[PDB]
Ligand binder design. Structure first.
Ligand code: 10B
Ligand code: CA
Ligand code: CA
Ligand code: CA
Ligand code: ZN
Ligand code: ZN
Length: 164
């Protein structure tokens, strides 16, 4: 099921930093900060990594909301289709996570895509996980809203392969 990028790219330090460069107007700023914090929390529990929010361009994981072509040669596409993308660990753009703000970001059952759930998937990519072929798993490449615990055995096995 689980996959890794073709060098098995991974962080080589334990104290990962992240910077929320900008915000969507879809949700209050404090709701967005907490959504991202909760998504890191899923991953910190199961690895030796910690995640510390910083306010610097030197952060490992830089998080941005953007539309269409937005500075990395991999353009977004308006509403629906692509929701977000992230790059495997390494310097600069690597490890960064981008969210399509042409999408409607929400939490809970209803309109839009759960920022928490999408961020959890994207942060998986930013730690080194590729897509899983196990349909029950967070890294399986289909968004489904759920209230249940996001991590699957396959996700934890994968992240253990990289940091365990
Ligand atoms: C299918 C793939 C070509 O496209 N994705 C880009 C990507 O890989 N982002 O990581 S996506 O934006 O549509 C997408 C699809 C599913 C999810 C996802 C899956 C499970 C839970 C939450 C989100 C996130 C983005
Ligand atoms: Ca980075
Ligand atoms: Ca889109
Ligand atoms: Ca939006
Ligand atoms: Zn991008
Ligand atoms: Zn993905």
């Amino acid at each position: 099921g689980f996959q890794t990028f073709e060098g098995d790219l991974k962080w080589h330090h334990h104290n990962i930093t992240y910077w929320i460069q900008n915000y969507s107007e879809d949700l209050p700023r404090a709701v967005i900060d907490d959504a991202f914090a909760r998504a890191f929390a899923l991953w910190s529990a199961v690895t030796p990594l910690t995640f510390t929010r910083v306010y610097s361009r030197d952060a490992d994981i830089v998080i941005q909301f953007g539309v269409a072509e937005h500075g990395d040669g991999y353009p977004f596409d308006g509403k629906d289709g692509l929701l977000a993308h992230a790059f495997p660990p390494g310097p600069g753009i690597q490890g960064d996570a981008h969210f399509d703000d042409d999408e409607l970001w929400s939490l809970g059952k209803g309109v839009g895509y759960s920022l928490f759930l999408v961020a959890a998937h994207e942060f998986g990519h930013a730690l080194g996980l590729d897509h899983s072929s196990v349909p029950e798993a967070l890294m399986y490449p289909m968004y489904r809203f759920t209230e249940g615990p996001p991590l699957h055995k396959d996700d934890v096995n994968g992240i253990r392969h990289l940091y365990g």
